[PDB]
Ligand binder design. Structure first.
Ligand SMILES: NC(=O)C1=CN([C@@H]2O[C@H](COP(=O)(O)OP(=O)(O)OC[C@H]3O[C@@H](n4cnc5c(N)ncnc54)[C@H](OP(=O)(O)O)[C@@H]3O)[C@@H](O)[C@H]2O)C=CC1
Length: 186
């Protein structure tokens, strides 16, 4: 199994969601960026695995579920089996990452992408080891009811650029945003 990564889009006031939806209007190229990053795998015969909480699963438009071309894993302690269209279910993040080391997955998964929500971001972000954060900074405040955890810049270094990630300011629907990559190793 390759690298561990989080990916998020976040407003200036650290918002990621409101009532099961994004806080801002849909940004088509931002979602295309998410799809491209999470799907693209630099290792033959493998797919990337996406890990998400249960609310994040149900917040993806049904037309996009499971996220195609990726192995889809949902975190939940209430569910007894994967949701319709999901591939795997785990009861904790450590359990999910252990599963990637099991016979049924060890040779199938390249990059692991945590794609939300808050609690799983927070746990991963404070667990020792090598982790990247792919952060889309939406450059406005938006009313939100779910927030991205604090990024500790003492440990997460902002990279000066990264292959496949545009460094300049983007704009869609009148909303400026930019792509960033952070890396810790502790
Ligand atoms: N802007 C962005 O980049 C993103 C935005 N979104 C949006 O953000 C919000 C996400 O909501 P959020 O509340 O954070 O929800 P989550 O997706 O984290 O779902 C929370 C539910 O997931 C299960 N869960 C979460 N963590 C774990 C864990 N480590 N182990 C086992 N089960 C776990 C629990 O379900 P159970 O009770 O069944 O145990 C919990 O109630 C939504 O509005 C969504 O649209 C989501 C992702 C990215």
């Amino acid at each position: 199994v390759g690298s561990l990564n989080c990916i998020v889009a976040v407003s200036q006031n650290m918002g990621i969601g409101k009532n099961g939806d994004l806080p801002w209007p849909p940004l088509r190229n931002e979602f295309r960026y998410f799809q491209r990053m999470t799907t693209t795998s630099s290792v033959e015969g493998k797919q990337n695995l996406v890990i998400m909480g249960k609310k994040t699963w149900f917040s993806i438009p049904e037309k996009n579920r499971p996220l195609k071309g990726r192995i889809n894993l949902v975190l939940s302690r209430e569910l007894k089996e994967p949701p319709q269209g999901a591939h795997f279910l785990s009861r904790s993040l450590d359990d999910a990452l252990k599963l990637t080391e099991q016979p049924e997955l060890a040779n199938k998964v390249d990059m692991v992408w945590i794609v939300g929500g808050s609690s799983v971001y927070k746990e991963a972000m404070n667990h020792p080891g090598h982790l990247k954060l792919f952060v889309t900074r939406i450059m406005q405040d938006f009313e939100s009811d779910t927030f991205f955890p604090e990024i500790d810049l003492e440990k997460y270094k902002l990279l000066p650029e990264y292959p496949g990630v545009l460094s300049d300011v983007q704009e869609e629907k009148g909303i400026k945003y930019k792509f960033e990559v952070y890396e810790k190793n502790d």
